[PDB]
């Protein structure tokens, strides 16, 4: 058994992290006080869930997790919330004042004051691991902390754990829940600085989740709680194989091997089905075929984009629930004859499938109805480059007049880091077009 450490940075990463660890506890049967009645090996183990939970002599199950925010209001609610007993006080890390939506402030100014402490708290978890695989890092593209501090943290992790894998879950910025005009700036700066340090990154567009909440949950103005409980389900499907018995994606190195043939093109598109409402009075349970087909509808993707106008480099199907292989190949057979599904030539056209028989779990009283079978598709499409083009265009509009640049320079950044970052992105859009058209 090989441990994984999760690092939640900034508001988005912490609130999404709350949502995930709650869901993990419900799925593994760990109570809010850290006890796990079904764990018969009191005080240790090398079970699958031990990848995410260490154990105390008193039987407490502790997330291999570190929470980091430059200001204390959000991580304070975890200190006092319903899962306070879950964490060691010193895996929650806060400071005095935040980065004010400013990448330079989270990275250069306010970042250096806390980077060594956080690395110390992380190192304290790494020494409790017989064979650490690497890290899962949760953050927003758009915040000052989520972008600025995370890229600083990523640099040092490469230096201190050069042989470990680093996966990301990144919240990509959407105006209908945005919080700063300058998020396109932070987004590009942090992608540029983090690219070579990340093995695999799952982008979640707030726009996509927001619309999936309104359309399929009948929530008129979705909250972060709505957005984040749905995100927790996608993350839980992605990580289910690190936490449960199985043979697909059993360690972090397998995510890169299976989804990332070129290092820089390491942004798989996640699609999920089905998403239903808990207050749907009468609901017919969808079939294997129905939910697999739903994997090829943009309206179910974590990022809006049109995969018919790109090329696949890898596809992975992750099912939870009442699913047997025969149904999956019947549903694939049929969809292949209906859908434009084009791979790149130097890659086999086909699918890696994993099935976990436990159906998805839901937060009791939440908005997602319980379903009998669900699926998350992970595919490496060149279509995801649409989201880089959108973001780079917004960056170009503002930077052509230097709007807001003075806020970054005032923290010690140079204009060169902007144009350097933007040029790396222009290279990233080219790489995608090589492979895709």
């Amino acid at each position: 058994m090989r441990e994984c450490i999760s690092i939640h940075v900034g508001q988005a990463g912490v609130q999404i992290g709350n949502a995930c660890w709650e869901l993990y506890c419900l799925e593994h049967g760990i109570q809010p006080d850290g006890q796990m009645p079904s764990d018969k090996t009191i005080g240790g183990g090398d079970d699958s869930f031990n990848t995410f939970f260490s154990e105390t002599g008193a039987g407490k199950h502790v997330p291999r997790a570190v929470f980091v925010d430059l200001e204390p209001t959000v991580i304070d609610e975890v200190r006092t919330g319903t899962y306070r007993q879950l964490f060691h006080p010193e895996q929650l890390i806060t400071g005095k004042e935040d980065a004010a939506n400013n990448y330079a402030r989270g990275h250069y100014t306010i970042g250096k004051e806390i980077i060594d402490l956080v690395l110390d708290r992380i190192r304290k978890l790494a020494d409790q691991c017989t064979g650490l695989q690497g890290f899962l890092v949760f953050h927003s593209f758009g915040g000052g902390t989520g972008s600025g501090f995370t890229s600083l943290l990523m640099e040092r992790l490469s230096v201190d754990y050069g042989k470990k894998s680093k996966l990301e879950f990144s919240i990509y910025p959407a105006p209908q829940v945005s919080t700063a005009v300058v998020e396109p700036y932070n987004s590009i700066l942090t992608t540029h600085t983090t690219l070579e340090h990340s093995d695999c990154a799952f982008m979640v567009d707030n726009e996509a989740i927001y619309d999936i909440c309104r359309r399929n949950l009948d929530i008129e103005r979705p909250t972060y709680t709505n957005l984040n409980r749905l995100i927790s389900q996608i993350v839980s499907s992605i990580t289910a194989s690190l936490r449960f018995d199985g043979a697909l994606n059993v360690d972090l190195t397998e995510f890169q091997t299976n989804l990332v043939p070129y290092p820089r093109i390491h942004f798989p598109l996640a699609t999920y089905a089905p998403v239903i409402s808990a207050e749907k009075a009468y609901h017919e349970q969808l079939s294997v075929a129905e939910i697999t087909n739903a994997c090829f509808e943009p309206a179910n993707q974590m990022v809006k984009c049109d995969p018919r106008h790109g090329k696949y480099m890898a596809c992975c199907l992750l099912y939870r629930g009442d699913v047997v292989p025969k149904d999956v190949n019947a549903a694939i057979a049929t969809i292949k004859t209906k859908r434009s599904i084009q791979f790149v030539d130097w890659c086999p056209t086909g699918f890696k499938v994993g099935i976990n028989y436990q159906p998805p779990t839901v937060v009791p009283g939440g908005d997602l109805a319980k379903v009998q079978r669900a699926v998350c598709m992970l595919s490496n499409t060149t279509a995801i480059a649409e989201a880089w083009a959108r973001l780079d265009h917004k960056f170009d509009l503002m930077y052509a007049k230097r709007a807001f640049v003075h806020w970054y320079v005032g923290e010690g950044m140079e204009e060169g880091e902007f144009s350097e970052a933007r040029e790396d992105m222009a290279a990233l859009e080219k790489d995608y077009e090589e492979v895709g058209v």
Partner: protein, 62 residues
């Protein structure tokens, strides 16, 4: 359509169905760039105190 590497266990199964085959910066470098940024801040703040000191002298002269 061919199936490969079928693995079963109590929790589920995994497998691969094919449809058609194919045809770092040192800690010192970080340290340099960070400190070059903090120098730039202090330079800017030293300039601000410099112009303020000039304003102080004009206040005295008036």
């Amino acid at each position: 359509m061919e199936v490969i590497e079928l693995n079963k266990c109590t929790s589920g199964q995994s497998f691969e169905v094919i449809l058609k085959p194919p045809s770092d910066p040192s800690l010192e470098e970080i340290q340099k760039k960070l400190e070059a940024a903090e120098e730039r801040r202090k330079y800017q703040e030293a300039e601000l105190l410099k112009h303020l000191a000039e304003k102080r002298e004009h206040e005295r002269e008036v």
